[PDB]
Each structure stands twice: as C-alpha cells, then as structure tokens.
Symmetry: C3
Subunit: 333 residues, 3 copies
C-alpha cells in the first residue's frame, strides 16, 4: 500500500545547483513529491544576442535535477499554464512503462497532471518532453533535464567501498539548431507553427548551431563559475538528451566515472575524457588537488570553444609544487 509510505515534498532548485538530499537514505522508501511548471520563453543563447523561443521545465535550460533513492516513488505534478501555446508531456528514462510516462502526461495549455512511478534502477537518467510527432523539436528547444536515483547505501567505488561527495553540480548540455538562410544568417520566426518546418530542416543537418551548458554561451563562467576547494570531493552530473558529448576537466580527471550513468556498474577510473551518449546522463567524481581556474568542456574543442560547450571551476587553496611546477618560466634565451 503506497498510501502507508512517508511522503516528502521537494522544492527544486535551478541548475547547476541541486536540491538538498541525503546520499545514504535516512528513511525507508518514500513517495517524493515534485512540481514543475512549464514555461515557454525567449532566451538569449550567445554573446551575439541570438534569441530563441525556448521550451522549459521550471523556467531553466536544463530542467532541474531531481534526486531520490532506489525504490522510492516519484510523484510529479506537471503544470502547463494557459500562458503557454503548446502541448507538452514528460518521459522519464528512469521509469518503466507508458513511454516513460509520456503516454500519461499530455497536457494542453491550462491543464495539469500527476504521474507516479517507482524508481527501480539506480543511476542518473535523462527526462525530457516527448509529444507525439514533435519530439526532437521540444527536446532541442531545451525541454530536458535529469533525475538521480541513488542507491539506498550511497555510491560505492570499484572495490565496493563508500564514495561520498562534498558538493554536487548538474551540467545540462544543450544542442540548438537555429535555422539559417543561404547566406548563413539565423532566421527569425513569429510563431512556433511558422518556425516548425525550418526547425525540422535545421535539425536534419545534424549540425548544431550552438552547444551550451546551462542554457547559454558562458553561463558557467565569471560570477557563475562553479567552485570548489582543494581537497573537496565533487560529483558532476552531466546530461545530453539528444547528442553525444565527451566531458573533460582541463587540469583534472574523472577519478571515478559512470559514463553511462548507472550505479550498479563499477566506475571507470582515472578518466581523461568520457563519452556520454545522446539520451544519457553520466556522473563523474573528482577530488581537487590544485587551485586555480579549470575549464570543464566537451572535448570536441570546436564544440567547446566555438559553439559554447565550456564552463569554469574556480578552485581555492594551496598550490602543490610536487604535482606541477614551472622550472624555467617562459623567456628568451
């Protein structure tokens, strides 16, 4: 009887931050209640000021990271306000049946729905909108996020000993396909319906115009750079709902990586770069050993540095000259 289980309500937070949770489950299985409100909105995605009509869960690209434990039930209230124009739904890759919930959650503007599913498999998983006939358009307009289903006894290393993270961040990587004309300029559209065919044509090139973290070029830089201290253990959850990516921490490693994101498997050790296939979430654990600026990138470096898939960590602490040093600084002989 699900009615006999504890209920807990979670208020979600904006990526790259993650709602408060416990790694090791302090209660028995629970029904965990989430609410998301769909927001269609204009978003500026690059330094040039290119503005798209984005489709979002909870006002952000990506949608927020949900965190539960294995064999919890997820109960999502999904609200489509009448200020929106399109039909939406949600498909959880964590869920079993009914197209991941998509068949049960179709909401027109002015409607809401509540879905419950049992999180039977531990791992990080993508969720995304998937309305019949228009799936890639919604996903590539930003309507995707992730859910983490932790093992009830938390994460474990390749030998089965505990791994505990001190901080967690969620990086959602988004491929956008802004339509271009013969000259190569971005085309502009008045209504979603007038945009649709050109959006399909742009998608069929399989060549994104932008590939960004947290919804825009430079979103995870400057005042919004990720932070850590030397010695801290950081988990970075990374998703890509549509297209392969290959994350890399410039100056660091993935000490333990679940590249395809599923915690019953042993992690890969000491990775430089890891492949997260399109339609997947992955997770990487790293202990910082040096201070300074790190770049966190998709290591197709054109995708990173020309198309947008690059963010920064600012790390505080002591410099270790045993690990790295300048022996002779750049100079003319």
């Amino acid at each position: 009887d699900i009615s006999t289980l504890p209920r807990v309500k979670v208020d979600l937070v904006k990526p790259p931050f993650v709602h408060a949770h416990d790694q090791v489950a302090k209660t028995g299985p629970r029904v965990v209640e989430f609410t998301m409100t769909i927001e269609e909105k204009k978003l500026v995605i690059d330094r040039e000021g290119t503005e798209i009509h984005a489709m979002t869960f909870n006002g952000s690209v990506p949608g927020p990271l949900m965190v539960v434990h294995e064999n919890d039930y997820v109960e999502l209230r999904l609200i489509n306000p009448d200020t929106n124009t399109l039909l939406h739904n949600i498909d959880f890759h964590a869920a079993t049946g009914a197209l991941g919930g998509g068949a049960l959650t179709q909401v027109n503007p002015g409607e809401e729905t509540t879905l419950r599913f049992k999180a039977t498999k531990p791992g990080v998983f993508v969720y995304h909108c998937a309305p019949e006939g228009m799936v890639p358009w919604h996903v590539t307009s930003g309507m995707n996020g992730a859910i983490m289903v932790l093992p009830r006894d938390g994460l474990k290393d390749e030998k089965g000993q505990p791994l505990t993270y001190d901080k967690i961040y969620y990086v959602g990587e988004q491929d956008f396909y802004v339509p271009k004309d013969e000259a190569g300029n971005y085309k502009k559209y008045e209504t979603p319906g007038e945009a649709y065919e050109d959006a399909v044509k742009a998608m069929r090139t399989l060549t994104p115009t932008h590939i960004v973290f947290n919804g825009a070029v430079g979103a995870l830089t400057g005042d919004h750079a990720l932070t850590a201290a030397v010695g801290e253990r950081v988990l970075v959850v990374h998703s890509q709902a549509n297209r392969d990516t290959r994350p890399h921490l410039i100056g660091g490693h993935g000490d333990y990586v679940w590249a395809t994101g599923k915690f019953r498997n042993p992690p890969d050790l000491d990775q430089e770069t890891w492949l997260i296939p399109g339609g997947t979430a992955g997770a990487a654990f790293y202990t910082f050993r040096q201070p300074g600026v790190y770049a966190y990138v998709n290591h197709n470096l054109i995708e990173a540095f020309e198309l947008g898939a690059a963010g920064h960590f600012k790390v505080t602490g002591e410099w270790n000259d045993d690990l790295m040093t300048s022996v002779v600084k750049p100079a003319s002989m």
Copy 2:
C-alpha cells in the same frame, strides 16, 4: 581434421527474425553451412517514395543474422548471380585473416565462392561487403549484416549465472547518403557507374539523408512491429556497419547490455541508452514488465524521428500500477 566434424545446414531468415538455434550448444563443434545470394535491387526507403539501388545479401537490408557457437566453423557459399552488375565479396569481423575473408571471396556476376573460417571469439559481430576501392559505397547501399557467436554454455550475467532469452530480434541500422542537388532534392541515376561520384560526394558530407531500421522508414512499425509479452526475456541484437548509434527502448531499459557486443566481458547493467560504435554489433537483454507500445530508437532523436531510426514493440499483458500510474489524469483546474 575438419572432415570428421558434424555438418549442419542452416536456412536463413529475414530480419528482424532469426534462424532457429540453441543457446547452449547441444553438440560438439560443428561446421555450420550457410548460403547467401547477392541481390542488387530497387528499394523504397521512406514515406516520400525515394527509391535507391540497394545492394543486399539475401534480398534484405540488413543481411540475415547468422548464429553459431564459439569454435564452430562457418562455411559460407556466396553466390553472385549474373543478373547483378557489380563485383562483391564478404568481410566477417568474427574471422581472422585475409581481410576477414574479403581477400578470398571476390565474386563477379555469374560466380560463386565458398569460404570457411573458425569462429574463435564469442560475441555479435558485423559482416559486410568490402570490394577494394569501393568499400563505403557497398556498405552504405545496404550490404551488411551480423553474426552471433554464442559461448558454448550460453550467455552469462555479470556474476557468471545463466541468462536465457525467450525471444531474439535483429535490428540492423542503415545510414544512407542519397545525393542532393543545390536545391536539396534527391538526385536520380541511371547506372551504378553514373551514380558513383555523386555517391562519394554525398558520403563525404558525413550527413546521412536517411537512417533506418530493417531497410526503410517505418519497417518495424504497424503490422511489422516487434512483439513480446510481459515477463518475457528478449535479446535485441543491433548492428551499425558504418556509423555510431545509441539505442534506447522508450519505456524500458537494457537490463544487461554488451554495448560493443563481446560476451567474454561482463554486461553493463540497467542502461538507459548504450553506444554501439560504427563497425560494431551490440546486444541488449530486457525483461518486459509493462504492456503497451514501446518505441525502440536511436536516441539522437532527430535521427530517430526525422531520419527514420525508430521502430515499435507491441507488448501484451497486465498493467502494473505499482510501477507506474496516472494519479490525476490531464485536466483543467
């Protein structure tokens, strides 16, 4: 002495079905005899009626799945009838030496050949045509399939206990490169030779015009949807001879996955989506837990829903409300 071994003749079946076989070997090592007849033919590949000159093993795209056991010998009689126009051969990724057999199997129209090789490594493997100088053209015109070399004691899980499948299907995913003009219309050609340079130019874009399962958009839908019952254990073998893919069962999982298809390795557990690199076959095992329609897709969703890489499962049985339920059906408040 190979002449002292049992011989068995197999008659192949059209994908996505697979010839009858035993998972656990009921005889000692055998010579397993297969015959394939090459057929060059017109094929309609999409709903628009786009027709290509396809190159096939046994009349289908993909070619049929061959199944043997580790350390069996495969003896293939390959027939190129005089109704065909081109030179063909075959390269087995399962085989050792002579370019996988390609150096030994070159047949002009009106010729045949018989190759024997020892299947020394267990796994699912690609086979494809590979005539010197024209390899990608033949492979991307459909001339590829797969072979499964089962361990003699069948499949095993990550802990070494038996995994037995109830049903098996073979999904071959094909990237086509139909030449386009400046306007973006598909060009049409009278002879293979007149097509060749434009085919090469289209291939060099690295952007497929179509990506399909079982030879056409929608081939694994409707009356030809895959089927299962709740509780059945299904193995899906998936190959891609030329280009990476990332299969996903919408509403399900890969419970046990050999993403790069080789059975001496432990399977990955609980996958949402798995990467099968171009030039590889993989295999995924799933036990259905919910009825209804599932979509089986390449989770580049543009590739799936715009370019063709999507099929369906129709699953019969009981709905489990513990696993998933609509709490409040879509409605206006």
Copy 3:
C-alpha cells in the same frame, strides 16, 4: 626532494615509432627529461597535393609519444624558435593543475620554457597545444600527441596476469578542416591571420575535409606500412585530440582494449571495433595469428576510405588453414 631522484634524458622518435623504454620499471621513480621544438611548416596532406600550414611538436603530426612510469616526473623543455610566427603552449591530460600545464607554458617565438609534473595516473593520455582564445585552431592544425604512463609493474590482463608487448606503434588520427568556397574548392591563405576566420567557419561545420593517420592520406601504407610477424604481440596506441574515432583492424581484433586508455581498469576483451572519444588516447593489444595485409581503419568507412583514416600492416609468417580457408575459389558454375 625531487633533486635526489635519478634523471634520464629521452630523445624522442617520429611516429608511428616509439622511443625505447622498459615496460616494467627497472629503476625507482625518476625525472624523465624531454625536449620538443615547435615547428610551423607546410604539409601536403592528400594525394591531390592539398597543402596546409601545419603546427607541430617536433616536426611531425602527431607529436611524438612520450613514455614514462606511474609517479615519475615529466620535465619538458618546450622551445618556440623565432622562425615561427605564433604563440604556443602545451596541456598534458596526464597532469594535474594549471590547465594541464597550459597556463605555465605560453611561449612566444624566440622563447622557451620548462615544465615539470608528476605522472600520478597510469594510462595513455593526449597532450595538445591550447593557447587561450585559439585552442581548436591549433589542435586541428596538428598540434597534438600523446603520453603513455605505464604502471610500474607493466600491463595486466582482466584477471591481473602480465601482458607484455613485443612491438608498439603510435597512431595519431588528425581531423583537418580546410576552408572551402561556395563551389567546394579548398581556399588558400597567405598568412595565419588572414586564414583564421575562414578556419573558424570551416571548423564550425563540424565536418572534417580530411581525417588522416600520421599526418597524411596514405602515410601508413606502402614502404611505411606497419609490420609484424605471426605470433607477435603488438600494442597500438591511438589518439584523437578533437573528435571521436572507432579503430578496427581488418582481419583481426583488439584482444585486450583500453578504449578510454586507463590502465587501472580491466581491458575489454575480443573487440571488433572500439570507440576512442575525442580528447582521449586508447590502447589495443593484439597477437597476430595470420600473415598478409591488414588494414587498420577508423570504422566510419567513409572517414577511412574517402577522407584518409586508413593504414596497413604487412604481416609475415605461416598461413593457418584451420583459422580460414578458401574451400571453393571464386569461379563460374
């Protein structure tokens, strides 16, 4: 005290060859001294005579393979002669801190620098130039290589028993983006600065014009084919600093593969084809069992046979008819 450790100087060799080293460490931890001189030079990259302005470490594409043992220190003297025009640096994926050394190694023409880092993680790793603001241009102009950090007790199999290679080769795979005009002809440029914007535009297509091994179409063929004898154990280290690749030995296998290149992990067994993500080095171990010509390719076969990512092995020794034989040679019935 690092000053108390042995020092050894290594003189590097041109790929695909590798400097002499010992698999199992015969000394304690050492400081291993390398020197590289940057050379900007014209290179002919294809059979058509297309000539680019290449940027190289030590005069080659890829840069040379460096080999050390876990917890050795790498001390690199990097020289940028005044005959060069651009600013360069180096980022080691093996290193920890300061953008892999990139923040500490910026050298203008006429300058040099010496970096030291501790090789704390065993595996094969990419190194590449990464000057702020111009990273992908330098990497995709050839300025990348790899470093192998061997475990001190050498390589081990999936069960922890020793694997010893008899020969080692280094294959660097390079994606080039030669700018094209409306007609599709390669554009030509007088100075690096006049080339830059068109280089960026060409990179943003995400469609390489050339994908080559050892710096040119056909570089690892003919008189420069790789060689082995039947029974020899060969390690092939393969890197791709920017773009995914999927190596395959046509007629063979990867007996033991570290696809993402990190030796604390067990190898994948019996691979047909393996995915090395962009920004990664991998390693594959194979024991040759048949003589003849093998092709070693990226198994996107368009990338291999149209764009250049194909080389040869010439293997000497006895033919094994048990493994493969022609039963009936091609003939007309």
